[model samples]
Structure formats: structure tokens, C-alpha cells
Target: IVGGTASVRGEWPWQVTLHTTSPTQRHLCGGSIIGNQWILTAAHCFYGVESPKILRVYSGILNQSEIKEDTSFFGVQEIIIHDQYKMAESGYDIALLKLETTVGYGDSQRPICLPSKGDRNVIYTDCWVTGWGYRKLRDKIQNTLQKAKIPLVTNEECQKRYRGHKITHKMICAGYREGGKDACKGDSGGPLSCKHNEVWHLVGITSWGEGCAQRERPGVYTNVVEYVDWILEKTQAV
Candidate 1:
């Protein structure tokens, strides 16, 4: 994450690293543990992945290199992308992954709560995004998890900054107006968590941005509040 600081171990228990299947296991995107067997991520992260067997979810790890030491690499059982999802730029960029087995919760592994449907109208301020994305537009992906406190902007305010782009109700924007911090490449599918009543809620899913920390270009995320029902429906179907 650009302009962010290294996150402490277990600080973001719901944070997960989505990776390709080994012998070349590589971190492709970040995700959130939304359920014992469900992972919430961006649909774009699976652009060409043909099967669930080719994907893995690495949880309970703060650093990518630590995967080899104490791995919680879970195999994917199924993938469920939004029905209306087309591309990252067009919105509906969310996806859900079912794991082969249920993950046990602990200090390092747990699920983040989903916001209530009515919470859509709530303006959350104490929000933070975490990922292992690039520190700079042209820099290499980070090994340690990085985090930044970003403020949410209403669609009206965001639309003014992103004049030509369509800031639909299904999407949410967050970042500083001066734009010094945001989720970047390799961060897609990560959690945009917000604190409400002392509990953390999955508010957004990192989707896209004009550029990494570019002035006036806040990161656009999939509005999780709008998809809570859709997610509950899908997750319960299985």
C-alpha cells in the first residue's frame, strides 16, 4: 500500500493473501476472511484462473515469506463472482471463494463482520485498508502487510474528483484529497475495514483507482454494504 506503514502480526486477522498454487506459489491479491469457509475478494483477481484447484488462500500470516514456516494454506473449493460483474472499472468487482475446509478462528485467524443493510447510509470515518501491494507505482510488491487509514468520500464528492468516471451507488471511494496514500497493484481484493461501535466491519473491497496515491484520485472499492444480502444469499446457498 502506497504511503502506508507495516502492519503488526495479528493486527488484521481477517486479512488474507490469495496465491497461485505451488510450486510457484505467488501472492496475487489480498482477501478478507468473511466466514469460516468463505473468502471475500475482487473478481478481477481471477481474470484467467480456470479452476479452484489452481488457487490458494494463505491466512494467519503477516509476511509472505512466513508462509513456508507456519502455513495455513487452504485449498479453494469453489469460486463465486458477482452475476453483474464484468470488469474492475465497471463496478460489481466482488467475488467469494469457498474453501475446502473451515478455518479455525484465533487471534491470527478470524472473520470480519459484514455491515448491516441499513449501514449503507452510514458515513464511516475510522476506516483502514491493509495489503501487500506496491509501495510505489513502479515498486515491487511488499513482503510485509501494509496499512493506511483512509477516509471515505460520498459518491457526490468522489464524482467531482473522478469527473469522467461513474461513481455508482454500488461503489465507494476512500483516500485523502491530496492523495498520498491508497491501495495499489497486488492490493486488489483486500479489505477496507471500518471501526463502528468498537467492532470492525468489512465496508469495502479494494477494486481500482486512477493511479497509486495520485492527487484527487481516491481508490474506488466495491461497496460491501450494498452486497451484504447478495453475499449472505450466496454463502448460505452452499
Candidate 2:
């Protein structure tokens, strides 16, 4: 994330890191634990990934330095990308990963609450996004989890700022008009959580943006509220 602060351990229990299981074990994207064995993320993260065997999930982790010594990383059993997610620009950027085993909940590992279907049109201002994405567009990824608070922008206002670009209802825009804080490269699929009644709800999934914290170009996300039924349809069937 750009213009973000290092988050404390357990501050975002639902936040997770997605990595390739190669020798380098590169962190590819961020995700959120929506169920004991389900991870919600952006489909663009798996651009060329054809199998789940090459992916791994890291939960309850705060810093990159701790990953090498940690033996708790989980494996993915399956990857379910939205059928319409052919390109990031066309919306429907969401996806789900089923873990090989159920993750035990604790202070450092837990599932984020999903917003109810009835709350689709609700405006959320108290929201924050977390990720291990780059601090700058072309810079290296952060060693620690980074977080930044940003308010939601309406589709109409976001369309005005984006000009020619389309701001579909399936998308939710968040960041400052002057652009200083937002998700960047490697942050895709991360959680944009908003607190409601003292509990945090997974409101958005970091999908795309024109650039890292660019002025008048806020980060665009997959509106989680719009996919609540789809999420339930898939997860509940398992």
C-alpha cells in the first residue's frame, strides 16, 4: 500500500498473503479469510496460474522476515475465479480459494465478517485497507503488513474523476481525490474492511487502479456487497 503504516500483529487477523510455492516463494497478492477454508481475493492475481498446486496461503503473519522460519503456511485445494473475470478492466475481479484444511481461529487468525446483501447501497467512511504491496509503483514490496484508512467514493463521483474509464456498480472506489493513500502492485485481492457496529466487515477487495496513489485516480475494488450471494452460493455448498 502507498502512504501506509506498518500494522501491528493480530491487528488484521483476516488478512492473508498469497505466494507461489516455488523456491523463491514469491508473495503475489493479498487476500482475506472469509470462511474457515475460503479465501476471497481478486481474480487478476491468478493471471496465468493454471493449477492450485503452485499456490500457498500464509495466515496470521505480520512480517516477511518471519515467513521463512514459519511452518504454518497453508496450501490451496482449489481456485475459483469468477467466470466473467477475463480482464481487470471489465469488472468482476473477485475470486475464491479453498484451503486444503480449515484454519483455526485465534487472535492472529480469523475470518472477516461479510456485509449483508441488504447493505448493498450503504456508504462506508470508516474503512481501512491492508496489504504487503509496494509503497511505490515500481518499488520493492514491504517487509511488514501496511495499512491506510481511506473513505469510499461514489460511483458517479469516481466516474467523474476517472473521466473516460467506466465505474461499474460492481466496483467501489476508495482514496483521496488528491491521491496519497491506496493499494498498489501486489496489493490486489487484499481486504478493504469497514467497521460496522464495532465489527469489521469485508467491504471491498483491492482490484485495480491507474497508478499507485495518483492524484484523482483512487484505487478501485470489487464491491464485496455485490457478491454476497455468490459467495454464499459457493461457500455454503462446500
Candidate 3:
């Protein structure tokens, strides 16, 4: 972990790995299990790859290899890439993956709560980003899951720093100005999870950013709360 601590076994059970190769392989991005049949991730994870067969999903293991216990791999049945997402421009970088069957539930595998009608209140609070992503920018990826705490930056300050770029309500910001902690390249599409008393809520999904943790360059994420309606519509679409 470049700026994080190793995550405990089964600490964040809903955490998911989106990779291109077989199990015990390259984790290109991270996601969260939102339901038995659905996963929440960034749209950019699908960029340059149209074949759903090229991607594999894994969950419930602290070790990326997961050759032993509490790990499962599943195939994709459908991919609901947001219609407004733009790979070139990078806004609306969110998507949902429909699993071939419901991912088996257990202590080591579960869904994270989303911010809904009366769910986890996480606005402006500190949150954690977890994954087996690169510790440093362009460096080796981690096999053990990791986590870091980051503050949720206001959209106004974030917009000002971006110089006229649109930081829509659908997006949220996190990270510090000093550059010690952040979500890097391979961390994209992971969850920015926040907790209320009894439950953890997925406040955001790892989206685009200026670079690795750099001074004045915080991590940008897709605001999950802002798209609850859209998510419901698409997840329930027939």
C-alpha cells in the first residue's frame, strides 16, 4: 500500500475485482457487489474491450490469488453501460454488471448498501476506498486487498481547482492536497465506501482523476447517491 494499510480478511466482503485474465490474475479495476445479480463499477472499465468474455469477476477473498477458500468467480450475463458515458470525455463513468447467476452469499461475500430513500447518511463524511490495485502509480499491483481513508471534498472546491471543467452533481471528490493517499490507475471502478452506525454505504465509485495522489489533485469518483433512480431503472429493466 503506497498510502494505506492491508485490509483484514473479509473486512469488506462486497469488494470485487474486475480483471481481464483468469482467476489468480491481473486486476484491471475494482467494483462493489450491489446485489445478488448486480455489480457497480466504472464505465471506463469497459473501454477498449467490447467482449464480455474478456472480463472475469471475483469476490470474497482477501488474497487476489484465491486458490483456496472463500473465493468465487462468475461469468457475465449482461453489461449495462450507462448510455451517457463517454470514454473520451470521461463523465458518467459508471456501469452495472449482470451476473449469470446470483453470487453466493456468505460472511466473506455480501452486498454493500447504497444510499437510498433512508439509508446510510454519508455526505461530507470520511470514507474508505478498498482494492487490490497498484500501490503506486504505474507500479506493481497488490495481491492482498488494501484500504485508505479519504475526506470527501466539496464539489465547489473541486470544480474551482479543475478550471472551468464541469464537476457535475453526479460526481464527488476525495483525497488531500498533500498527496499522501489516493486511488491510482488500477483502482479505478472501486467503491468509495462510507459507514453509518450499522451499515456501510457506497458513496462513490472510483472514476477519473488527474493522476496518482499529487498535491492539490484529489481523487474523483462517480457519486452513487446522485444516480439511485437511474440505477434502479436500469437494474430492473427487462
Candidate 3: RMSD to truth: 2.7
| Clashes in predicted model 2 | 0
Off by over 4 Å in 3: 22-25, 67-72, 88-90, 117-124
Q: Give the top-scoring candidate (lDDT).
A: 1
TM-scores, all candidates, are 0.97, 0.97, 0.91
| C-alpha lDDT of all candidate models, in order | 0.92, 0.91, 0.81
After superposing all C-alphas onto the true structure, candidate 2 shows an RMSD in angstroms of 1.2
Q: State the lDDT of candidate 1 residue by residue for 91-162, as single tens digits.
A: 999999999999999988999999997787777879998999998888887989999999998889989988
Worst 10 residues of 1 by lDDT: 64-73
Q: How accurate is candidate 3 locally (lDDT)?
A: 0.81
Q: Once model 1 is optimally superposed onto the true structure by TM-score, how far is the C-alpha of residue 20 displaced, in angstroms?
A: 0.8
TM-score, structure 2 vs. true: 0.97
Q: How accurate is candidate 1 locally (lDDT)?
A: 0.92
Instruction: State the number of backbone clashes in model 3.
Output: 0
Using alpha carbons, what is the TM-score of model 1? 0.97
Order of quality (TM-score): 2, 1, 3
Clashing pairs in 1: none
The sequence of per-residue lDDT tens digits that candidate 2 reaches over residues 1-238 is 9999999999999999999875567899999999999999999999878889989899999997778745678899999988878777779999999999999999899999999877786677799999999998889878999999998998898898887778899999998989999999999999999997788999999998898999989899999999998898889996
